[PDB]
Write a protein that binds this ligand. Structure first.
Ligand SMILES: Nc1nc2c(ncn2[C@@H]2O[C@H](COP(=O)(O)OP(=O)(O)O)[C@@H](O)[C@H]2O)c(=O)[nH]1
Ligand SMILES: [Mg+2]
Lengths: 152, 168
């Protein structure tokens, strides 16, 4: 409980003290958010590194099936995306609607995150449970740069 | 099928995320992150027609978002939520409706007034004020509770019915 609030707020000394005190790294709230989820969502790179080195889980799901990579891609944190990728996070995970992190990044309009996710290796044409792909999302939004990146 | 865009707007800690999760998953979440904004999709049959609804769970206006602006300028139906036990949320409804009308050119924007947290015996806002305001705006008003799930589906179904009226 204290670890979750410390990770959400962005406290380094408090998180380190709680970890040394014995707080579990895989604690979760009612929906299922873990300290890694909150640290990636809010944008605290150092806390993400400390949690990863401590032994946290990098492919943990919430009640909707979203991983920390999903939250990092939907927010727009490039460094956290790269750090999560370098430790073996599933780049082609699916939530309860079967949305790849590429889908979320393309819908938000984060071109650099899209390029990083493509460089790390991810299929462009993946269909969710509603028969939609990233290219279709780009068509619906009408963004020219996203379509240029996807078609190339 | 047809795609209907529904945008949930209101103040903070009024229960927008709780209502959206209650509709999509049929489950009440005790605590949710106050900053997560996301789009959910559901397929439902209203009256005698099946349809698809995509709902944006708005969090706030702290920073500019392209997806949020695109939904605001394109979304057809709007759900204006307020909590019965707080009156500042009730006051903010006028500003929210004015912003929606301004961004959407204010022709015939369909909106539905929603009163959440109606399962608490302590309340500072009564049904008289909310009903009078809704009748002044000419929009339906529905009381909702995310814990007992009363009115959770009725609000969205009334919104889509009002949307059909605008097209017709
Ligand atoms: N008793 C009761 N509590 C509610 C209701 N709706 C929301 N809440 C509580 O309000 C708190 C915050 O609501 P939240 O989901 O964050 O609404 P949001 O800020 O608009 O996204 C949650 O912890 C819920 O327990 C309701 O209908 N009844
Ligand atoms: Mg919320």
């Amino acid at each position: 409980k204290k670890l979750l609030e410390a990770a959400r707020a962005g406290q380094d000394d408090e998180v380190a003290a709680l970890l040394a005190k014995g707080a579990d790294v895989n604690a979760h709230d009612t929906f299922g958010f873990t300290p890694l989820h909150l640290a990636a969502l809010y944008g605290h790179l150092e806390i993400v590194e400390v949690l990863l080195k401590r032994g946290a889980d990098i492919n943990a799901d919430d009640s909707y099936g979203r991983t920390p990579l999903h939250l990092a891609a939907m927010r727009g944190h490039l460094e956290i995306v790269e750090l999560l990728l370098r430790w073996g996070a599933d780049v082609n995970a699916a939530d309860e609607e079967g949305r790849t992190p590429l889908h979320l990044a393309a819908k938000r309009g984060h071109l650099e995150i899209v390029e990083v996710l493509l460089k790390n290796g991810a299929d462009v044409n993946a269909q969710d449970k509603f028969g939609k792909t990233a290219f279709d999302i780009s068509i619906d939004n009408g963004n020219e740069d996203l379509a240029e990146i996807l078609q190339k | 099928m047809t795609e209907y865009k529904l945008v949930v707007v209101g103040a903070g800690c009024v229960g927008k995320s709780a209502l959206t999760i209650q509709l999509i998953q049929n489950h009440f979440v005790d605590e949710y992150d106050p900053t997560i904004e996301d789009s959910y999709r559901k397929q439902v049959v209203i009256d005698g027609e099946t349809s698809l609804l995509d709902i944006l769970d708005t969090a706030g206006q702290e920073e500019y978002s392209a997806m949020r602006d695109q939904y605001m300028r394109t979304g057809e139906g709007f759900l204006l939520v307020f909590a019965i036990n707080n009156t500042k949320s009730f006051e903010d409804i006028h500003h929210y409706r004015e912003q929606i009308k301004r961004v959407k050119d204010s022709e015939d924007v369909p909106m539905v007034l929603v009163g959440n947290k109606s399962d608490l015996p302590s309340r500072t806002v009564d049904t008289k004020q909310a009903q009078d305001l809704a009748r002044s705006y000419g929009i339906p008003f529905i009381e909702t509770s995310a814990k007992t799930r009363q009115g959770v589906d009725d609000a969205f179904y009334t919104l889509v019915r009002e949307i059909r009226k605008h097209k017709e």
